[model samples]
Target: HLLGNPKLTVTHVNEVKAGINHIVVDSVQYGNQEMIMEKDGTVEMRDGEKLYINIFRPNKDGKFPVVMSADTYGKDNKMGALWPTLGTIPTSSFTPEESPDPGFWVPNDYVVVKVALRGSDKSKGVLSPWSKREAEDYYEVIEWAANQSWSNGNIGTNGVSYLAVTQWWVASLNPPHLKAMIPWEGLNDMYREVAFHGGIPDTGFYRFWTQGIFARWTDNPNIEDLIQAQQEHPLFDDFWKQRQVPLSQIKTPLLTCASWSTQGLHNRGSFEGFKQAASEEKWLYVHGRKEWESYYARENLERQKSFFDFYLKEENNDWKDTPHVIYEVRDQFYKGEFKSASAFPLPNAEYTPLYLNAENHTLNHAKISSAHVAQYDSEDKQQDVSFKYTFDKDTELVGNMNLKLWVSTKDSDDMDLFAGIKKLDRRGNEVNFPDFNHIENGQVATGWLRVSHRELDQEKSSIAQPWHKHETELKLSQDEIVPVEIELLPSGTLFKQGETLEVVVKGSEIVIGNSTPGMKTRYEHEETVNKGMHMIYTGGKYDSQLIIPIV
Candidate 1:
């Protein structure tokens, strides 16, 4: 599929079709659709105008539903350009090896359509991000496809990353032809999904994306227009509001597949899609692995088939009986599959508060006498504040958890917070997981926040899911402490009768285990506040505490 280039290569066509024995077509340029931009009068087609849709229909008799992808990268270059530029640019991801061989085709037995997105390859449009025009264009294309003679009038979209983002927009439109989608590892929220995290810009990711992904193509033509729009807008900006697909608008049944490693971007949207989509039949699937590799796994592919089969084929697949949520959680590297009791925010859990009794460096439900404080700075020294709690009889704390504290700084305007909560055995040793990076004796769950973006969204707050409104910067006056709450995502495990819960705070990033330097941001990473002074005040009715969702 050559955009305006008017080029086509079929070095492997005969061999590929002979080896697979499937129907084939070359390209169907989607940018050529008349729906891109109609507001400004006269119609204009984008460069690389035209989409190449290669359909591989089964030799069978019955008409089948369509499985489609609209990718930005060249269709022939299946691996994409993201892999070669890893580590250097925190943006984009790569898998060391391919999962389901590139040769295996699901549409070989059904109707499969693959098209090029606007501006990439043989697709039209002046080359832009997933802008409004692009989405509108996709909406038109999908509706156009649904009305096709070959189509059973049922269309399901599927793709990773860029291809996924478009789904949020089209789904919001609720085109009658669109029935289901498998948005694997895609970012739907333009603000938090791509620009910033809790108000802090993803410098590493943004810059890397510009250089690594966009830099390859010499002529975007409207590069300046695109960059300016994105740059001027930060997280929670008004521009995003237009792009944000309100949950109330999502009506199409969906299956959002997310990867744990890409949690910052992909997970947020998938979770939002699962939680907010209006479709009665929706599902969420989470996988933890190198981003792209997980998609090709047999386990995931089979799961995808069954999901579509039940909805598209009207099969007796029992998907109706499947759990509402399927979380592929990883502990240390070991996979633990858990089902959500009722959609997300699992229903049978309690957000039990684990108060901070800093007087004795302990966390408990009981009241304490005094609070404790510790200090650190840019010099890079270990600044530790500990909390200890124990149970007399066997008690199990399962589900997501969080911590709340009141802190202030003297020297720095806003400090960075690095916190870790662990479970310890009676012998005072930290519990070790052989599969994960085993630290001295502790197992940890952590979260971070820049003090300036400490504002919380009260209405959206939940023990299991804490929402922060990082739009405003809350600076502290000298010695003045403000209340802060941090939410740690869902986790489950049984605590023994004598197990002790320990909490640790660091003034800087902890470079240990799988969490080591891997925590590097898409942009430049920074140390928490306080060039030298950082303090935590607990107890004395201050009510500093940890909130755990107990099942």
Candidate 2:
């Protein structure tokens, strides 16, 4: 009757009441009860292939809106080792990197489906991740769920990482039945964000993801060629292009989420999607901490439910009043204050440059004539240089950052530079946060640039964000000075008065304790040893400096 009526008759309120009562009664009846689940239900595809789908729905049975996710991770892997090792999930329920949880959604009156991608978990075909065929498979799956007897034809998608990544690819196709998506944290470009970060091969994470994790769960994995292709090509080619989703084409309404800490990958893509999507209605929420912690937290889920309820259920909730952008200002590891803005980069923020003083190892607003050089051996862990600056007044640094440097390598043809910004307490002690390894302190921000891939896309690049068009590689000759701009991951932090902000320039990345028992640091990066001396030239014509957004 509610659907059939053109107008409400006191009636909309009554329907809402009845719906709430039904869910409550169902909850009472099913207390401590398992959600009705179907394991590996088969769905036939247009290409004569079949995918194994695991589903969970309410026992009470009227047609309901569907929430689905598709990924290469097994339909029944239950997140395998990472959750148990970290003690983040209980055996009764799981958090499989973005897939829906029956424990959380089913009782709330939604049908949740998790489908194993082609050639994974008994699905019938070779796994070709991010391919057009794969995208089409997801498109078909959504339509099929819509027409099913249990589905009310109103469908939505939810997930994080691989699950989130697939939504970007499929939504770009403009699938008719797909209504909305919540891409928690995902990468939009393979070459730029994943395979080759800053034109250097992501040797760590890619290898671990494919051979270490996916291989163990997938039936017959076929990702070796993908890895080899990245290694062989090195340049931006059609191989990487075809794998990236064109965010500009995504018209689906979105609640895109990201974290300041996932610097290496998801954070950039999440923001880019929110900024560049064709969708008129979209929201961005950037938080701190690990992906799982934020994704599974109750407050975040309530926010997401409100958004989904408005769009998918057509409820007249106050979702419109929700801020366009909501973010956390990091005071320290595991602590911060929530802030809101009408747009990202906060309208009131100012981009200020802090010039590097090579002579005194300090950062200042004024550029002095001191032409100094700081040199270090790239091969030695102890050979690193740092510059520190203490704030005169309390300040907040938020948004994207850039580091411009006049650098040279005396012994090698290429240089791999690791640049990071860390916050020190007024007491001069390093403040840290829980990184991939539980033992690591989180840095304010980090940026990496290989000298050879320093060519910029002038048309698309900006002062704050340097777009590296990795189409060509230009190697450096020994002792040749070249100016390169490294784009740091966006950050949000407050520096108390008298606190110190230290910038460290090193040849290698910061090392930490082991991650998840078996996994290496997030991604395994290619090793670029510096047998020769590496130099950072500051002042005079060099004008090497750090750019920070002050709010």
Candidate 3:
């Protein structure tokens, strides 16, 4: 294998496309073909709990490979008017939220199995979302799918968000029939990705995600008091350790799709799944479009079909010739060219340091000669400091970033720092893209760091990717300056000459878009521990810089 895994025998290739900066449409026209749609049946687990499932298979006399997805979301729930992203899957597609459209799969000679997780819908057992417990139920469900008369004893997994997250757990267990899995936009880490983002409790989405989940349950008491665990365990502890599964344990053939838009939730996990998993045969698809739009797009659906066809059906296809890593080099909203690469942080990619010019409020390629301090009022909601650098030529940033800052405080001991990397047109208007929560307009990417939780895991830290070890809090003393690295999210964008790339620093959460009653942005940390003047030191003595990936 090009990547040096002896078991990985095939030489990976990229999917050729139009060009490097062309735009593509994301509309869909999913028509249902003749298929076998059955009523809800039950699958008995080892503990004797029954999980509700509905099977969709090709209307033929032959057995077919199965693509199974088990989630807490009710299997009977159809695509409704409430979901705006339903355009990707037609209103009559008859698919559950964010799962694979059976209409598309079954007609293509594959059986689609959608199962309700334990304690969800008519499934029996105590409700436990994404625990090692739920994964076992999924394992038994996969085994059951393999034994079905319609199944060819070959199984795969597919879905987004919660459904995607379940794939990580179930894949780690390595079920015998589980041949391939596409964990698109999956959140594998509950601690860093969901519960505690940058060591700060996310009070928005999790509360909304778990609100009425317990309403449909069994007689047994639910032991997972997840939100309460987040409040009590501010630091990494035993509770989080239970949620941390080894990605290396996942050995199934994979085609992981990561969304650049889902930074706060599924972004990190999507990238990590491909990077950390020991899966010998794997490919990664990186996109900057809205999560669901990318998942169900007609073009992407074909990619999924080609991927599954080769692995499950054992058919000869050009999919193996497709790139190991295909990513969108996004230039603006819904615009970018699909490019190919052998590895992420592309092996030849350079991490160049752009010095922060505190005196001029600009980012410079050359180091500043004199020392300067940029201050922002930590108590003020509207006030934040920013540095910008206009591109001299076309440049593409294709990976993660790290911001090293020399910071100090006068009236406070701790600072909750929020950073946003944004794109500005030549006309000086900031560019935004479709956000993860459907905000319509959002920055290139955002990163967060609670000053006290500045400690980095040296073994895991790199020049561009600074992995923070939020194990302890070391408060700042008055007038004491310290260097802390803020790990930023991954992004892919093309800045044409004359365009500007700006980095903003603030105390409050980086407001994405206007949150009206109808449209609420789910990226906010309300419990910030910030006070007094937050000062950033740059130049001569203090080497404050923005380390970005240049390909």
Candidate 4:
């Protein structure tokens, strides 16, 4: 009866059959009333209330921990969105396929719950960006399920990005039955992590994502418009902070999976959550390469299985044998192989700082005690800085990529950088991996940054990476330079005795359209970022070197 009572009543929830491979669900159906003749089957709720879930249950009758899956994008046809011609995202049937992942929900005798959040699909409600209503509905659905007969009063949640974010919201409330959560590539600060990066608005990703979520319900939806309309608000204010759940309240064991390539959206939050959560059992899995590709890779998924088995099923099975950390052990190429490690920035790691010798366009180990200047256009040309190291014997580089650059810009408000790893044979060919989108013959890890945005909230910074507290921007002076610590995402690779290692820097996004024939699509600036210059710095300790994690 209260104004903000968590209870919500749905007027209509038309249950319709959704045939997903290996899973079956009664999808709630809704029609567009705005255009009488343009109604489509937008999924609503189940039996007038229950959160419609795509259930993946084991054949064994024994009780099991509940596994919940939630996300902003519709889970029904995951493959369809990725490969439309395939008719579904991962598979035509409800089952997952081998490419992205073959056994996402079908493993280890567990129950999987994939629920479409309200306002997005079969759930009913007006869609708003990160609404409190969304979090409350999640809490309601979670609590209701914990009391169900099939559940053992224990639940573990998993999902990427938006789906991963909701776990923070639910866990913050400290649901009695919530046990564990794995927030893969999710963000803690909604504004900095999503719409804006380091105070500058990430117009590209926000516009693309909101439009997709809104389009799922009705084309005439107002959620997208409402989000962009609020761009007038200051960055890192009370409004944005309201969307984040206080980290201190989270008690569940958490596994924060982050990505190296995700510069715009989820990486910072993922790393921050790993470092910030008060939970003693928290673990961090920082990955290199693509988004969905890395999340569902074979090695990565297996590692997850080991963790869930130990906690959810009480199966020890030497889960500790599988290192407490998982990093991509480089020196190989499965193109799609999922590598795991024991600690991040790797234990016993050596910090090999390679300096950029401005005059030679090279990277050298010599310490540059002096400062200097380098400049380039935002959209035009970038100063190419190269760093190389040769191994007398085979060596493995695993852990976080760290770089410290002192920079100042002339006539510009920001700077964009594309930092990447490369390998060369004695003959001079780059070692190419299919998983790195086969970008070039020899690149391993990559990172990006806009100098003015290198703001850090020390309280939230990590050992491997310094997070932008996102408090505010440090505007640059014409000739004044400042030092910044840049942390690239975690990765692994082996450097053979005769091979050479190189880190390449560019002013623009590394997504250079592939010249290789039969490529699906090339890197399109129009598609990635609508505005701004992608620039880079040249030399001096100010723009000096990269930190390599060597064991």
Candidate 5:
């Protein structure tokens, strides 16, 4: 492997159990000693509560660097039950509850500490997700791990999704022993990123997630507390703000991983952390695919190991030379290759406006002088307005997307906008990719906006990225026309010459065709029951357009 010291000879062995392939390992040991596994050890929190942790390390009594992963998901249910419920293969039970596979890392001379978050399993405390209290408990766990006789007093965090998110919270507290982290595809803001995406309530994924947790632990916090908050608070206020971690406060070295496909949730937050984090040494790897598959893939896993090996073990490895930003450029249906850069939006990338010409149903660089109006029935997907433009040369659409529209609604005073960008072949065939849920879907980028949540943070807002304040609701007046700037998810895709770039504006969320018929997309966005005619006014004075970052 190009990562870490080249002398370590690692081998993988699969140990099957309960329909899951558990990853076991045989490797050249640190001192030719065997590995040891300890279960259900107690760690006292800053509070009076005692939390449980399962530790894996070498049998020899020497101290070793420790890697910690904690989550509400029980340390006991190693193979998550959510997978089987989703009709997918269960992850390996030995995978350490969304953390590193200990069988693999322990052999590499590291200790893997998997902890059950407070109020889950055998642990005690009120159950809370991303709560300040939980974060403090996690901080205590880190310090405790550092003080263990088997520990060398250095600690780092590694995990994906919820497990990864816990790291952010604790790292912000800045535990003295906390050394580094790899927060893979995790969300930082619960309200903005998960519960209420773009001010629209997301009950589906949240409910599914809570249901899974409820099944595992009966005394946990009311799942409805989060869901009820979403219903009661449609705007970003103290409630949501209290739940967020201050990204700029994180100073520990980080190797952050994100995926382009998880638009409704993890995608944006991961990139935001990498971009806004105060970490002096931070790297970003944006990939394409299912989250678990990407997190556990041998190559990617090893790359992460190299990162920890360098920071935690103080190894003089080539990890320091790794690219600051590594991103996979998407092709038709999948990610085809990778490109490296020093920063996101590549400093030289140009922001190009694709003017919307409603009359001709086309998108082009030339702005039209004639005013044209496109109207659609909000209840009908087929009635949505669409514009297409064919590229004459290969191009890379590499950054954030901004959509400006002059819109109004009839029979109602409010509108929920669902906009999407798709890539099509010269033959006019839609090209899909591995979207969320391992579903085949066709959207290079997508964005949502509620007419009432149109206020922008002027100081942070830009032409290519509209920063919605989401502070207060401003409902439209009867027959009133409003201008909205919807910021779409960032994407990196290579558009071949003659391939058509298309944009669709509608009232309902876009659901692309899925390869598996019965498989549902994971996210359950707020259902829109529109009893209105949505009007999109383009050209002339309206000057509606799509702004893209072209590399």
Candidate 6:
């Protein structure tokens, strides 16, 4: 406790009208310092608009590294969570939703500032989520906060979900003050990753998110803009492209906390952000827990703080020595442990293909002898087709998995395919993992494809993952059999010798059967365009198979 660090402590009780005293004398981790909490902070933007801020820092006359995050969630939304997974978030008023906890950061010689973004709380401006204007506003706030007397001209960003997304947005602008950032489970592309998955519209999460966001009525009036934008921009055209966080422009030191649990939302985007980002100093921490549980864990928080301590405060720490990639190499539900690697998709990772055989509903190591058709009712989840593969030796698949399929429709010209991968015990029992907003039974990973929007973005496509260009629809002709590649989310799983891996492909969302009532199992898309019977052709004539990252 030799450092003059700041931390909230009850030194004296004020007697003012609103006698709210937030001061620190002799920090819990330090000694002889006043941890000042300014609830009435404001930053003026260029357009004469002001953003309401909450500043927590040492009252001493010196500078400290700043940790900042801005979002539509009110800056004062302390201890506020009433939704499904969030209701289980373990936090207190001292920690604003997903933002930094001043009680911990201040005493560690850091200043934590939470900002109520444009058109939220006391901030004055139009409320726009994931827009170019929002990025501009965040950059302005960063520079302004950096110039403050309390700031050391060095600032880093930290937060979860919406708060995390803002970090990516601001970092894309390459603001000089942004020295580091940890976008814990944040999304990069608003179209492919959020509103639309494989050209199918997301019918639930965003609606649930926006409603919960404006529950108490923030200043923003365009509450319907998101879905409305979704309506007008059904394809990946200029509108959707303009809203993405240009990963090429992001070069800030990054600690991306991507979660495997968030299969449909933040999972893919977080990994993509890390892979596509130009940051020379970047690290990836992929976990198999819910965003809330993983982000706020004491150990995880300290590890992240160590990153900030090094990059923002210029401390000589062991952060540089840490592995560039640390991912949860899972077995069953929360069963496996973590491992470290110098880079993701280990240098020796092999892209092994398991060809689908419709005859026995199994995956074959060699080409099947004859062509066969697997049929399934379009709307019936029970009629979904499953292709299984048994490993002869212990194997670990640690990266993206893509499914190549030859599909056709019986009576319609379009098809929507949802493919999921799950592990099975030697006795044929299903073994799932911690899925999105779910802690119980779930698939290892999932993918989606709208056959009409199956055109590839060759420039951005990779051997492990295929980037779909959902620009124009190429409808199938009568009795057309098309070969399409479906890109699945990433995963790292250890399959013991004799353990079986199954791939389930269906027309509807793949919600695993479970008893965990009320937990979200699958990403809902109620307005899917599936009509009539669907057919998956495999074996001799068709080269339908699943390519896995075998490490």
TM-score of each: 0.77, 0.90, 0.91, 0.73, 0.91, 0.92
Worst 10 residues of 3 by lDDT: 18-27
Q: Pick the candidate with the highest TM-score.
A: 6
User: Where's the lowest-lDDT run of ten residues in candidate 2?
Assistant: 17-26
Model 2 steric clash pairs = 98-160, 204-524, 205-523, 205-524, 433-441, 433-442
> For all the candidates, what are their Cα RMSDs to the real structure?
8.2, 7.0, 9.4, 9.6, 4.8, 3.4
Which sections of candidate 1 miss by over 4 Å? Answer: 1-49, 59-62, 79-108, 224-231, 258-261, 287-290, 328-332, 335-340, 378-400, 420-445, 490-504, 511-524, 527-530
Candidate 1 lDDT over 1-551, as tens digits, reads 11312242322233332123332222222111111100111112343245444454544566667766665554434213423312221111111122111123333334656555566554434555656666766666676667655567778887677777777767778778888887776666666555554454555455555554365445655432434555686446577666666666887878887544453455566667677788878877765444555565556666777877876666687776667766654333443445455556667667777777655676777655666654445336455677888878765454456777788788767777666666677787776431111122224455556677778888987766668875677777777787777655334444567887777776654434332344332333342344556777787757778887665
Q: How far off is residue 145 in model 5, in Å?
A: 0.9
Candidate number with the higher TM-score (3 or 4): 3
C-alpha lDDT score of every prediction, in listed order: 0.57, 0.76, 0.80, 0.56, 0.77, 0.81
TM-score comparison, 1 vs 6, better candidate: 6
Ranking by TM-score: 6, 3, 5, 2, 1, 4
Which pairs of residues collide in candidate 3?
A: 13-322, 13-323, 14-322, 14-323
The residue-by-residue lDDT of candidate 6 on 344-426, one tens digit each, is: 76677899889998889999888887899998998876779999998999999989999999999967788899999999988
Better of 4 and 5 by lDDT: 5
Instruction: Judge candidate 5 against the unseen true structure and give its global Cα lDDT, from 0 to 1.
Output: 0.77
- Cα lDDT tens digits, model 5, 61-114, are 689999889998878553233343122322334554467777567777789888
TM-score of 3: 0.91
Q: Give, for candidate 5, the lowest lDDT window spanning 10 residues.
A: 13-22
Candidate 1 positional error at 377, Å: 2.6
Candidate 6's displacement at residue 102, Å, is 0.7
